[PDB]
Structure 1
Amino acid sequence: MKVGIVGSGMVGSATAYALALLGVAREVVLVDLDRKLAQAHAEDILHATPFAHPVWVRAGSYGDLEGARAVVLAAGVAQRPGETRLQLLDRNAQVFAQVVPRVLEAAPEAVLLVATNPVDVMTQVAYRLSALPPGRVVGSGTILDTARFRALLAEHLRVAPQSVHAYVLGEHGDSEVLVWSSAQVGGVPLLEFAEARGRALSPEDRARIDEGVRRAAYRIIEGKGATYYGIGAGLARLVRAILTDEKGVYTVSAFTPEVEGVLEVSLSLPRILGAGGVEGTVYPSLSPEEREALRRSAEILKEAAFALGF
């Protein structure tokens, strides 16, 4: 199978590296306006393959995406000096206006995986331009935050991360919602399980975990300038789910008809991911606070998108 990646920057290239090291697909094609950039990353990664799995990583044009089951959209422009977020947001939106058509022209049956930030708005942008069914356009959303939430809970509770069922939903960023109320461990309520195991989650413990999840991007950016290793692996996992028609549940962003009253907005919710993209939503129980937090965040996202023209 073949996987395409448009945008060969740190996110795009890290994703290609992870796909290679984990042997997710036989062929990986990197596409970027900067031809040499893509060729360099591809060749650098190709030197790693003898030490992992036989994967053919190369740079190419949109036409080379022919037959790709999934195409990652990690395209964007470097923020020029004297430019606001809304100014930059408009530019990346323009980039997508070009990229989306090109990609589909070569591979009209691929699932589109949006990674460019802000992921939720850009997922909506890609969806409107794709003219494809809602489920065919998926954004990475809160997949990393959900996984980190489970990891921190697992450490606190002294249990395997695989046994922790917990989600981070909504808008990827400072307004994301940590769903404490309906989280579970081995099927039993989280908080209940914690206390019972002599590892009660106190308000202080919850605050510490919240900052551990919510401010990860902040800390990483402050120390290295950008984040990419985590999302590269997360994206590689979503690609794997699509290529293997896994039908697994992931907190990813997708165009949603209605969310707590808010209409036509893209945000993260637990969704079944397979060969055709997302094919079902598993809405969990929410506390009044979580539901209200999700609603308000969705409301804002709807306006942010509408204001941008989508």
Structure 2
Amino acid sequence: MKVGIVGSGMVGSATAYALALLGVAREVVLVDLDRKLAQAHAEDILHATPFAHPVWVRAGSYGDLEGARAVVLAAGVAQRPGETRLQLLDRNAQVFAQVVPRVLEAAPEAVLLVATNPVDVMTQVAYRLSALPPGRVVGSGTILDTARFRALLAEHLRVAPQSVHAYVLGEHGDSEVLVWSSAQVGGVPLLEFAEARGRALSPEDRARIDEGVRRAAYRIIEGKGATYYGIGAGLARLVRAILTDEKGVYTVSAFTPEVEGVLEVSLSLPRILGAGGVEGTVYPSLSPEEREALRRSAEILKEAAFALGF
């Protein structure tokens, strides 16, 4: 099987690295405007393969994406001093108007996995331009925020992250919704589990954890300039779910007909991931405060998309 990655920057390359180390696919193709950049990352990653799994890693053109079961869109415009959030959005939408049709021309049957930020709006753009069934276009969404939420809770509880069933929904950003209400561990309410563990989650602890998730990216960027290991692994995990027709449940972004009264908007909800991309959407147990948060998050994304024309 083959996986394509358009945009060979830190995110696209870290993603290829994860796919290689975990042996998700026999072939990985990197495509970038800067051909020398993609070739360098590709050789660097190919050299890692003898230590792990045989994988044909190479740089290429859109045409080289032929036959790919999934293509990760991690292409973005370089940020500069004095660039509002909207200015970025417009520029990246221009990038996608070029990339999407070019990718689909070479790999018409590929599932598109959107990473470019703002991921929810870009997922909407990809969806509109692709003219494919809604589920064929998936955005990473809050899959990384959910991981962050689980990792911070795990550190507080001294339990493996994978045993912490907590979710983050809505916008991958400021208005995201941490679903404390139905969070559970071992089949019991999170707060109740924490107490039993002797590591109760006080209101102070919860506010601190909220900040940790919400300000996660900002803090990482402050220390190293950009984030990429976390998303790289999240993208690789989603790619594997797709290539293996896993039918696993993840909080990812996709075109949603209606959510809390907001129509035609892309945001994250728990969904079933398989060979055709998203093949099922679930609407979880939300408290009133959470439903309110979700509505607001959806309206924010709806207006951002609308202003752009999608």
Query: Shorter-chain TM-score: what band?
Result: over 0.9
1:183-209 per-position Cα deviation (integer Å, ceiling 9, x unaligned): 111222212222233332110111121
The residue matched to 1:273 in structure 2 has which SS? strand
Q: Corresponding residue for 1:146?
A: 146
Per-residue deviation, 1:83: 3.7
| Count of matched residue positions in the alignment of Structure 1 and Structure 2 | 310
Instruction: Give the Cα–Cα distance (whole angstroms) in 2 for the partners of residues 80 and 161 of structure 1.
Output: 36
Per-residue deviation, 1:81: 5.2
Per-residue deviation, 1:95: 0.7
The residue matched to 1:151 in structure 2 has which SS? helix
Q: Is the 8 A contact 2:256 2:263 kept in 1?
A: yes
Per-residue deviation, 1:158: 3.1
**What does 1:1-310 correspond to in 2, within 5 Å?**
1-80=1-80, 82-310=82-310
Instruction: Give the Cα–Cα distance (whole angstroms) in 2 for the partners of residues 82 and 159 of structure 1.
Output: 43
Per-residue deviation, 1:109: 0.5
Instruction: Give the Cα–Cα distance (whole angstroms) in 1 for the partners of residues 80 and 197 of structure 2.
Output: 52
Q: Relative to structure 2, which stretch is displaced further, 74-83 or 43-52?
A: 74-83
Per-residue deviation, 1:182: 0.6
Q: Relative to structure 2, which stretch is displaced further, 151-160 or 53-62?
A: 151-160
1:41-73 per-position Cα deviation (integer Å, ceiling 9, x unaligned): 101111111111111110111111111000000
Instruction: Give the Cα–Cα distance (whole angstroms) in 2 for the partners of residues 225 and 163 of structure 1.
Output: 31
Q: Provide closer, same or farther for how the CA distance between residues 151 and 70 of structure 1 changes in structure 2, counting only shifts above 3 A.
A: same
Instruction: Give the Cα–Cα distance (whole angstroms) in 2 for the partners of residues 108 and 303 of structure 1.
Output: 30
TM-score, scaled to structure 1: 0.97
Q: Relative to structure 2, which stretch is displaced further, 86-95 or 247-256?
A: 86-95
1:95-135 per-position Cα deviation (integer Å, ceiling 9, x unaligned): 10010000000000010000000000000000000000111
Where in structure 1 do 4 or more consecutive aligned residues deviate above 6 Å? none
Q: Is the 8 A contact 2:144 2:234 kept in 1?
A: yes
Per-residue deviation, 1:80: 4.6
Instruction: Give the Cα–Cα distance (whole angstroms) in 2 for the partners of residues 147 and 81 of structure 1.
Output: 30
Q: Provide closer, same or farther for how the CA distance between residues 50 and 285 of structure 1 changes in structure 2, counting only shifts above 3 A.
A: same
Gap runs ≥5 in structure 1: none
Identical amino acids, percent of aligned pairs:
100
1:248-297 per-position Cα deviation (integer Å, ceiling 9, x unaligned): 01110000000111000000110000010001112211111111011011
RMSD: 1.2
Q: Is the 8 A contact 2:168 2:251 kept in 1?
A: yes
The residue matched to 1:103 in structure 2 has which SS? helix
Q: Relative to structure 2, which stretch is displaced further, 72-81 or 253-262?
A: 72-81
Q: Provide closer, same or farther for how the CA distance between residues 156 and 81 of structure 1 changes in structure 2, counting only shifts above 3 A.
A: closer
